[PDB]
């Protein structure tokens, strides 16, 4: 629904190497458009969408410069974190960051995001007021006090309200040809044996974009989600995505059931039933 930008950043330390592995990935409307990786031949922010090619060389040197700053910031934080959690040297550890902003259909700031994780667990997050912080444990409380003192919240607030939103407009305008596209799901139903007098009906949705989609079964026209196996939406690898829902019904009474598929690319939802 709401347009969005995100920067997903990761730092991984490792035994032997003094420099940790840093990777930053940028998303516009959940579609990857830029990437930085420290282990690349010539580390810089690369375009990963065809519509980003039109940015000038000056744009890319600014972004690469910020990546270098973040590498240094992540390195220092990984070291502090190691001390906070009383961990031994020579190990391997992860520091993750999610930054970004949501826009309303009216094209302005809806919600701002800024949150960190350590070893894949929540560490600290900027609150929705963009003023206060939520620390997951005692380690993160030490970071909180330090950041409260320095006015770190204000800094990120100016980013999420300022440049995050301003630059999202430019990216949305430049690449609306590809971003606002919608490929409709081509759907069907398969029938498979499960046990004595019971059958698995599976509802397929294939070749759809964007990933947002809802599949539900129903009994006699009434929504049915009791014990519905619903798989994780997965990429086809050609731009589009795939998904299925399934339900276990009695043998002979399969006609009673129908699948329902909702997707923004359709003029109206698909209703399907397994036929011989």
């Amino acid at each position: 629904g709401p347009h969005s930008m995100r920067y997903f950043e990761t730092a991984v330390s490792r035994p032997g190497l003094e420099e940790p592995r840093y990777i930053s990935v940028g998303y516009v409307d959940n579609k990857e458009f830029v990437r930085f990786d420290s282990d690349a031949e010539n580390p810089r922010y690369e375009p990963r969408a065809p519509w980003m090619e039109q940015e000038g060389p000056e744009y890319w040197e600014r972004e690469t410069q910020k990546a270098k700053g973040q590498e240094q910031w992540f390195r220092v934080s990984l070291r502090n974190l190691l001390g906070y959690y009383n961990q031994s040297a020579g190990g391997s550890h992860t520091l993750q960051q999610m930054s970004g902003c949501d826009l309303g259909s009216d094209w302005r700031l809806l919600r701002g995001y800024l949150q960190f994780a350590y070893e894949g667990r929540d560490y600290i997050a900027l609150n929705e007021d963009l003023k206060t912080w939520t620390a997951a444990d005692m380690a993160a409380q030490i970071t909180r006090r330090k950041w409260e003192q320095s006015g770190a919240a204000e800094h990120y607030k100016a980013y999420l309200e300022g440049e995050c939103v301003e630059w999202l407009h430019r990216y949305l305008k430049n690449g609306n040809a590809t971003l606002l596209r919608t490929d409709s799901p081509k759907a069907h139903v398969t029938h498979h044996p499960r046990s004595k007098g019971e059958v698995t009906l599976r509802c397929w949705a294939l070749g759809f974009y964007p990933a947002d989609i809802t599949l539900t079964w129903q009994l006699n026209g009434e929504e049915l989600t009791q014990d519905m196996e619903l798989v994780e939406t997965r990429p086809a690898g050609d731009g589009t995505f795939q998904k299925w829902a399934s339900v276990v019904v009695p043998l002979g009474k399969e006609q009673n059931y129908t699948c329902r598929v909702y997707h923004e690319g359709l003029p109206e939802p698909l209703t399907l039933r397994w036929e011989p």
Binding site: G26, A67, Q70, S77, N80, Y84, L114, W147, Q149, S150
Partner: peptide, 9 residues
Amino acid sequence: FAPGNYXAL
């Protein structure tokens, strides 16, 4: 346009 962090954890 990526962010620039200000104060380490």
